[PDB]
Symmetry: D2
Subunit: 300 residues, 4 copies
């Protein structure tokens, strides 16, 4: 069977195992540095299988050797201090897991997302197409959710593309969002759409402020699981993913959220959308912020 290793069995990691288990895509290995945590969550989820009817081997471990020969490696072990702390963790996870699964596609979740994905590429030495980051699917999901709510339509009929990174680094593109092929601008007035775009930018913080302790995990995990499925089933999904750029949108040597075709080979194509002056202004300012974070990381 296919093999998926999730490094970091916290809220996002365990929830990702939950979403994946129900899909019955393959074996799942939950790894963490804390003893008992992954073993307990994995066994708990495994014991729910007879009820849900899925046949999935879900195991927990503290030994990287158990992640060997994985088809996909999901990294959810993350916690300038933020960059340093996460850089050290990401470094540790990738330097230990990558060598054991040379043919795997690595999907980063740790924040700062774009920067941590860049670091994972460096440490793993994997072809850039096989090291990607999850950020855009979650952000587009919030946007799509708000649009469906406001427009009064099924979430299954709303599509949307966006780029960049989190919050201020986010590059919203309402022009590239539709409901059953019809522009979203036809359903929602400019003023309200602007509010929705703003709510999207602050989407992660909105959850953090409500939970008081901890950040979002159901949607982030769902986003991550969808990307894992895309690779495993070679589905050719068109989605915004953190990818390594070599000229697209005028950006070079940097991980940035862009539209891609995701399949068995990881990033199989980076789409280059013809953005107008206003949208490019947004992307340039975003790339500036992402670049700044990337530089801070390189100076560590």
């Amino acid at each position: 069977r296919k093999k998926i290793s999730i490094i970091g069995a916290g809220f996002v990691g365990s929830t990702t195992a939950h979403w994946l288990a129900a899909k019955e895509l393959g074996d799942i290995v939950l790894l963490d540095i804390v003893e008992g945590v992954p073993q307990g969550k994995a066994l708990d989820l495994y014991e729910a299988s007879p009820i849900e009817g899925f046949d999935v081997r879900v195991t927990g471990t503290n030994n990287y050797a158990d992640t060997a020969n994985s088809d996909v490696i999901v990294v959810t072990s993350g916690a300038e201090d933020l960059i340093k702390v996460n850089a050290d963790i990401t470094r540790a996870c990738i330097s230990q897991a990558a060598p054991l699964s040379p043919n795997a596609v690595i999907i980063m979740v740790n924040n700062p997302l774009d920067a941590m994905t860049y670091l994972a590429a460096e440490v793993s030495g994997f072809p850039k197409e096989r090291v990607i980051g999850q950020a855009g699917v979650l952000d587009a999901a919030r946007y799509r959710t708000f649009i469906a709510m406001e427009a009064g339509v099924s979430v299954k009929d709303v599509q949307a593309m966006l780029m960049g990174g989190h919050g201020d680094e986010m590059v919203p593109l309402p022009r590239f969002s539709t409901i059953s092929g019809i522009p979203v601008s036809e359903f929602i007035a400019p003023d309200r759409l602007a509010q929705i775009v703003e709510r999207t930018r602050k989407g992660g913080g909105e959850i953090v402020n409500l939970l008081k302790t901890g950040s979002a995990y159901y949607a982030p995990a769902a986003a991550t699981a969808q990307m894992v499925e895309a690779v495993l089933k070679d589905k050719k999904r068109v989605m915004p993913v953190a990818a390594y750029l070599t000229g697209q949108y005028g950006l070079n040597d940097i991980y940035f959220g862009v539209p891609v075709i995701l399949g068995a080979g990881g990033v199989e194509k980076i789409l280059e959308l013809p953005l107008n002056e206003e949208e490019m202004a947004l992307l340039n300012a975003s790339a500036k912020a992402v670049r700044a974070t990337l530089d801070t990381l390189k100076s560590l």
Copy 2:
């Protein structure tokens, strides 16, 4: 209790619709037909597949309209794969089924689609929003399939809207189709897209020419079942369906394929697209043809 769906006409499309619905576990299914044994056999066969698929659906076959009473949704797939023959079949089906399920949403499938839906509305006397026809979901599905195949992307990421009726009456709208929010024109060039539009127009005939002895049913049934689901779960799906127009697109007193929000109340909203002059030219010509068929019906 559970929701109740009655499928009138247990042929290829009707039986296949029962198959798609059963797997969805949306509620009881009653397959009715004028031919004895046929609906009973297909219904029992499908029911016997339930322990394998793990779904709890009571699917039964019958020749008695009394068994369709109090249905939440009535699907009509009894037509013969022309206006006269189907007009009589449709009137007979609706006249017997409608009175027994006064709160049901009727989904017409019989061809000529737009015209038969109009007839069902007349005979049933049901509020217009609760009498609709399936046509556009199937045609948009063929279009989306071709786009997905050509672009090399998941069908889950392709969406499209179109209007009108079948074949020459279809009103393609490539401008209103996207892949994850991105215009299809970004993936497929003009000439190739035009070929896909043409293949979509001839989509039904393409399957007919291949099967030789009948018409399509897997996709037509899937489309029909998706509309049934939209109603039963009040999903508010945005899809092209045959609806009664009262001024939209400049059309009155006519059933025509238009974008709608489909839910428990049936057509809960008819969307008004900002069609350009080229697209409007196609729509007007289509309406003229649909109008012609309607006149012949009256």
Copy 3:
């Protein structure tokens, strides 16, 4: 649409919302006394809907008025002191939610399960068939999981019935467990089967010891969600549920885990299995322990 209210948006409650949301059974209301917690988890899960493709209205609240007219009420707000603390919480939740949803089926999860279900029946005044407790489905799930693992077969082909309550109160019945209709005893030797039965009894504690902080939730939530689905779809599931007895197995005026047919009417039938001398010895000792807990509760 159907309406499900989950009282107590903690690990079990939020996870139950997750399992239910994917089933697309109806609207879900997550309620908690803590501000922000339910609103955050509900919104997080709602934002995952466009990714998973399900249309489910998931909302969080601190106002019981938002649970009015629910089809099913799930209680997962629980924390002699244990009985008292949980008795007070259960009392508060039921006395406030029951009056607002007079036609709902109440499914208790709070521990001590059997006793808390009994209390919910008293406080709600609902017909006993409409007040049940989840315990047996989870326990049978662990048992079935261990059997599938050992026998080397799909979890979809293992069935098992058991009675009583948790741990020492559990009444295992290997004789009433099969794989595609074949007795489990045909696949697993007596010594090993005994170990599996023992592992089942300690199943909850095994997870607690691994997690160190907190108890199981994936399987408990799955068990709860399966019971909710049984009521909403009037599925007539045959499962062990905490029900009110009036003579079955020689027990009267007590909630105890027994085999039932679960549907729209809640408990539609309490099956009376012909247990042998050995099994009855187990059930009597269990009923003694459950009774003791029930008495402690009545003396509060």
Copy 4:
């Protein structure tokens, strides 16, 4: 890449099997038939239903065996709904398909089932564990359906094992059927159970008598698709299937319906039930009949 499933014979059972499998999103599906247009039409029709159902499955139709190369699973549903006609059809199908997919697990559906599976084993020369036949899953499904209907419980909670072949060759085993681990005898009395056993024996004929012009396909296809899934996902399902026996139940050199653990390796284990003398009497008589058909084949 994806898994590849080839279905030889695009008739009712074959096309319906493609339908069940497509919804499962297990891998590519190739529908092959000797009749031109038929497989192509059904495959394209089903493919066009994918954007509606939201599944990514490449389903294609063909008349060329070359398109079935390197399949993980080969389903054979080409037989005519007797030994001679199907023996020739089966030999032709296996002789052409087997060499192109040397690592595939062959699942026979053609009747006479046990005999045709034996023939497929001979012609393919494949390890016996990788050549099996579908028969028991369907019969057990009918039985489980009747039990569920009679007991008033979910089909998800009913499980049962049976052996042998079709109709008079079937070896019912009510003793080995339960509802959530509880013996069926606890819910249904002896006489009623006997009636259900008889209805199960005649289950196939019951559908035939109703349809009038053909045999069952929804449940037969579901059963076949479930076996395909078991192999592709190495699910280790415990089910009755036609397997090659080397001493089990005292039977040698014969294909017979027996309980097995079905996975990626095909039959990964043949279970040996502790049958009493009554049940063994039924099995011996059944084996005698299956043996008779086998002799006629040789």
